[PDB]
Symmetry: D2
């Protein structure tokens, strides 16, 4: 009994990870899963595939690392936060695929609410923005979209759930219908002061309460699981959080003012705002983090929809790189983007913009622009975007951050990193372990299980493997930025409202 196990249900892959008591990484599992675009603007995931992969990674992580059911103190869980599931309570079968948080299909529905004038209400109790991004719209969607859903829904025959929930249920044979604070926040269904489903929003979206599941603390005993092994082995489930929050947490951004920015399929920037929830005026998200004890807290969140994904697109779709990591190479074979700009609004915009109608776009093409500029453009867009939110933050925040605690798959790229310090004019912290989403999940659980007795017990745990100071002139910084800002403006509003 001396291992903790984090579960990370990524946007593109399912991960499984293994730490010890000194919190190292004994092992990793990963599997990607099919991403579906039934139609341009839309994103879906197979719930079944989401599962399997997530299960198998679990099982495969121990196997290979040669660990037995028995030594697993507990299991923590983080997931991508907005994607929505709905299935028959009985058969445990989805009434429709999972709609990822990217999928813009409920834009239209958003229009309605915007118009009924719920904007202030929503910013107010949920702290969210009216976006197809959030779960509510989605649920109403399956709901309206499937024959007598609403009905079954009422007869409590159907279960609504995010990923964490779905995970756990499956996990516990349908025994446990739960989810933690953090994940509830982004549903735009649950009140954040109150701390429990906004009664108003259910009516609004026309959503039968029967369907929701209990909400709990992010750090706590929720259940157990039997994955086989040596007769009588049950594994506990003591930790749940959205990756974002997980990272935040595994980053030890446990006081107000503390923040990090993560780089994976998207970009997330979160600042801990302690016990008090700052209402943003600069196009940010107010949300729930975790205190040093898995306690409710608040946070300022800036969400970027596309980051490493552009890069995935380069390779899967554009097929211009053979592997992610190549980007560094190619992008550095030139001195600039040669006037080029990418606006990766592939799935709309996001903070601080919030533009369901924007699409992805390339700018300032000329004859002599080759592929290397493009790729490089792609990277930098990442860098701009952040700049977009960071400011917003300092705006809303009132704090002027002095360095950037980043993390994610992509922090591995040094270019992007340098580029980022430059463009920012800020220091950039690069911790020695980049799977913190996973840590935050280990941390939360084992906490819940006295695997660790408190945070501090970790503290000297977090190590900056490298830091980046800028190097470029203010003039050009702003100079390049302006370009970016203009590029943005050309993109927004592309798609037509039906």
């Amino acid at each position: 009994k001396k291992y903790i196990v984090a579960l990370d249900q990524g946007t593109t892959s399912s991960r499984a990870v293994v730490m010890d008591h000194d919190a190292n990484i004994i092992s990793v599992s990963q599997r990607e899963f099919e991403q579906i675009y039934p139609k341009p603007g839309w994103v879906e995931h197979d719930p079944m595939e989401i599962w399997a992969t997530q299960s198998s990674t679990l099982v495969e992580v121990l196997a290979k690392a040669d660990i037995s059911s028995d030594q697993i103190a507990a299991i923590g869980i983080t997931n991508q936060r907005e994607t929505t599931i709905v299935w028959e309570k009985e058969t445990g079968k989805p009434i429709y695929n999972a709609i990822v948080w990217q999928c813009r299909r409920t834009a239209e529905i958003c229009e309605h609410l915007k118009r009924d004038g719920l904007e202030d209400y929503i910013r107010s109790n949920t702290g969210l923005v009216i976006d197809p991004y959030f779960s509510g719209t989605k649920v109403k969607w399956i709901l309206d979209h499937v024959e007598g859903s609403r009905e079954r829904a009422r007869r409590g025959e159907l279960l609504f759930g995010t990923v964490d929930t779905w995970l756990i249920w499956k996990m516990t044979q349908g025994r446990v219908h739960v989810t933690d604070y953090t994940n509830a926040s982004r549903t735009m269904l649950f009140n954040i002061h109150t701390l429990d489903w906004d009664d108003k929003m259910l009516e609004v979206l026309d959503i039968p309460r029967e369907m929701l599941p209990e909400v709990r603390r992010s750090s706590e005993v929720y259940g157990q699981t039997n994955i086989g092994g040596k007769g009588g082995t049950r594994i506990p489930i003591s930790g749940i959080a959205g990756d974002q929050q997980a990272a935040l947490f595994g980053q030890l951004c446990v006081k107000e003012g503390m923040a990090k920015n993560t780089y994976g399929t998207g970009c997330f920037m979160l600042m801990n705002t302690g016990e008090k929830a700052v209402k943003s005026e600069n196009g940010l998200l107010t949300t729930i983090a975790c205190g040093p004890t898995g306690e409710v807290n608040y946070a300022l969140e800036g969400a970027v929809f596309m980051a490493g994904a552009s890069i995935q697109w380069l390779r899967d779709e554009m097929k211009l790189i053979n592997d992610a990591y190549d980007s560094e190479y190619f992008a550095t074979k030139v001195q600039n983007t040669n006037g080029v700009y990418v606006v990766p609004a592939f799935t709309g915009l996001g903070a601080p913009y919030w533009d369901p109608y924007a699409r992805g776009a390339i700018f300032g093409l000329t004859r002599g622009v080759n592929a290397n500029h493009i790729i490089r453009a792609t990277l930098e867009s990442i860098a701009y975007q952040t700049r977009d939110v960071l400011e917003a933050m300092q705006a809303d925040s009132g704090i002027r951050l002095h360095a950037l605690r980043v993390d994610g798959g992509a922090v591995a790229n040094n270019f992007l990193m340098q580029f980022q310090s430059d463009i920012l004019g800020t220091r950039v912290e690069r911790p020695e372990v980049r799977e913190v989403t996973a840590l935050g999940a280990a941390y939360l659980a084992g906490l819940a299980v006295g695997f660790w007795q408190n945070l501090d017990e970790l503290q000297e745990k977090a190590v900056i493997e490298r830091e980046f100071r800028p190097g470029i002139e203010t003039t050009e910084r702003n100079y390049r930025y302006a370009g970016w800002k203009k590029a943005v403006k050309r993109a927004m509003a592309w798609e037509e409202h039906d």
Copy 2:
């Protein structure tokens, strides 16, 4: 006595065709040359390299076809229209590279003029539009960049010329310094009415009249060349015309209201308006063509900067494809652009927009979008463009095309062909022989020296290879076209000038 040679010094390649009296392409020779992009929006060529390749070709088609210097009746010359070259007479060495019609460096220069109510005149006098495209401002520009050029030139130390102009001089060792009408009407410098150098123009731009060459007829001995051989052999240069203008003539559009479309590096639609010059109101150019005799005729013209070039760009720069023939195969792997649009303003706008500041851009980008979608979007810009002008054409022309006739490299592409057909809803006629440009120069030089008594002998000559009636995909046309429009507006105004 047996053959005539056409010479096509095209934007991207130098060429040499051998026709017989029967009007048959007996042998061919292509050579490609370097495209220089000193910087974004600028495109130069090496004048020597132009020379270089163009001589090699001629020398090459001949050998190959086992043809002796004596057997050639005349030499015709066609060329890329607007590139300016400038050299010393005493040495025949350029003070600068050829500056391309593409090249957008003289934009500032155009704003001065615009600023000086110079417009009405220019249009009036030259039938052109203020824009970086003309050798006008170009010339000037070199003059201002090279130390004490002006003075030398005044003292007639420096020669000025277009391409034909440079070729002929080169080929007649300095002996002859001349130009034809068509060409000359593309300088901004020359009066299409008058039939001679506009002084205001020469004044306004401050170009020394010494540098200009003799404007001549499109069909007329001008001199001769010595390419060795038996000995005593001298070959005459009987024909000259701007390629756009040569193509039109080779299409035998010698009567008023007869049109053609040309797709090579760029796109150029022309209409023979007979002895009367029609003034554009729709963004079109008024220019000089040839009569059925090689005599001054007038044409309305639409000009698109980027046509075949894009495929080359995907090719050389993007490397998405291996060959331009390819493109088709990729485009037909998908059934729509996935809503992605491309605007090939790599080198500014042009007809009917004229916007030296537009730069290329790709729009409606999304995650399921791949290379093919892209390649295909690329070909579509092509038809979109042609549709654009084709309409100014009919506004201006008042004539409704009951069918397009076309030519150039690109027309071998049936995707392009058929698309174009459905996009326009008009029929598209494709010849068996597509180098109708060379033909036109064959035709002129030939007509000149008695090789053929008239166009008559050449009428029975053509043959349509394919006629592209518009695929049912002629219902959804404004719809497609409409995205197009939207898209363009978004391309417009990229580069910074203020």
Copy 3:
């Protein structure tokens, strides 16, 4: 309850997991490729943890993905890559050396003495085996000698040995179980095929402590149970074991004497069923245990080809000449002959009927016009060649003239291959509807065991000849191309220095 049977295929390049219904319908498949280690030219290894880890996650995964729950599995079938040797520590359960693969050749040295020593007839007689590094014996000894004080702990109980099945079953029973079937045991070169038990002459020759040995068992029989979680007290019976080859002969219903099949996976295996008589080869073929219609020990004539689908992987992965294995046929068909080039896929020694551990891969007949495609096709070709090779011996040894070859394996997707083979043999060819005959074989057995099925014939109406390739062209070529091939071989033979 219990509607499903699960086959486990632990192949040389991947591990699978297959779910059948009572109708013997693959309700789900799972794969995951795994590393191929070549510490040195001529040697192949695997990681027993990786073999494990893969095999694990697959099972878990097919289940998952198909929504089948543990309570529903009547039993589990088990198949494996046959010769590969593993040696762990009973306590820790950890290995003291990587799986050494049948392919591997480090043992020829040892093998060298055994020849030296006179051990032919015996080995062959009692084993029906030949002296070669293909078989586990030599391998074992090897590790024993390489690992320090192996023999001690070996005799002190301490170390276990196992083939794959051994290794997987040991692992799914927590160590509780240490079984093996006949089929499998035969391939060790350690155990007596007549006697039905470990041959101690051997054990003595090779100096292998019987402590470390496991128990030979019945191919169809409950050996034990596994626990993979679920509704407490859930466990699954392990009723089936076979070497995939034999495993395959069975799935294919070749349970009567004179019945054979050919299998095209990573390699090539032809086996004929000899009823209860163990026919002694005299043409380079092996004699091995097989399965009667009840799991009963039968006997077989077997031809073992080391490089078959392996070659194609080489091309794609190593030569990188291909993207997908399915590509191969396309390219090959791109040429029309191989331009007289031959490929000899002896990357891993010779194998029947030659057995030549000193031969290495080689390519012949190259010329300046020989290109990739020709080469590819040569590769494919080499497969139908090695086949015709053994097929002859089969009918030497068998004395039976097979009228049509029945086939199976992953590579039979190849129409080209299938056709070429047809022609090369000048015999018809039967492609089944399903190709996972191997996993099938395994389900059958373990299901027969647990009464899933009461008899084969139940399953007879299963098997649908999806396609039949009849011999194409005339003899002449046949023999002609063959001679070509023979030549080649002889020059492959004897490369390595020993």
Copy 4:
């Protein structure tokens, strides 16, 4: 006045034209590759016209682009690929058949008849050539026998026979002149190297009308003029011709006995000057004619290897393994060695010291973990091997172990290869700054005639070794690797089936 000499390099794969000056620098170059045609597996053909046309445009382009007038050219030097045989109609000036590339193997059969009729000794002694389908003889005859009434017209004075120097010049004199040189003429196996003239037995044995051969001349000397137009009445002396190998040797100032060079191109050639002395060789080398310090007649030991640069071109154009020959280096350095792989590149048979028309190209040591890097790498090494093969025959035959190796050719750029090479022989490898040496010879051969330069000394210090490669591999290793090759080689032999 006349401030420049121009060299025409006509190679097996591309047509060149170089422009130098009095200070023998290179003002410019123009190349162009031309189609390799393989009618049948082991058959090598070229469109005479393409050879022509390419040489033309190249000549033209150098001038044109360098801004150089016919009036400025002191003369044209000429070199070519050596065995490729062209035969055309005197009237029309048209090839009766493609040009048969030296590489071509189609005449083995015929070489058989030869050996069989006891001629090995003679051929070896008057011509200095070994019986193979390498040389011109059989080619001609082949043609001859294959074209209906050729022989007839060929006596009837209507048909012409030429190597490539010869087809060029005549194409550039409008048929005025039909000449050839010592160097080239010696590779036909129809020319006696002492007598220094057309072999009768030769013509006899082979049935070739004396009436078709150009006339044999010096290497440096004025043979004609050409007119390429320009400023009226401009003529250009054609003042030099040599087989490019001999050209290289020459352009290396390889001019006294003991002096030798290795050239690495589409093939690989190694030759060493034996002065005036014609050494018959026992070790498989070639005996031929080279140039004296004045263009006078010299002699040499040649070592001819069929594929060097061509092997890579096969990776690049056929196997598509690399996209650029220069890449080679890159790839092969991603590996420490070659996983026991060996590439024997007998695409075109053997060649010295082997001499095996039946030999095919092959690959050995194949194993599962062998990737394309190893193949490329092996490819490279084969070059090094073969060199070491001829190299030895040479020391055998001449008693001298080369202290340093003077090299050149297009492939000498490959640093890897260079080094490997050093390693494999355990000899120093001198790399000149200008590797374009074949041309240079030609220029030298020309300007010299035309008195452009009066002596070679004028030319001496003009040479500079850009790089020296010393062997960095332990003897054992060195030899060890050799033995392997040697083994591989044999397996390669006699693959082909001779009825």
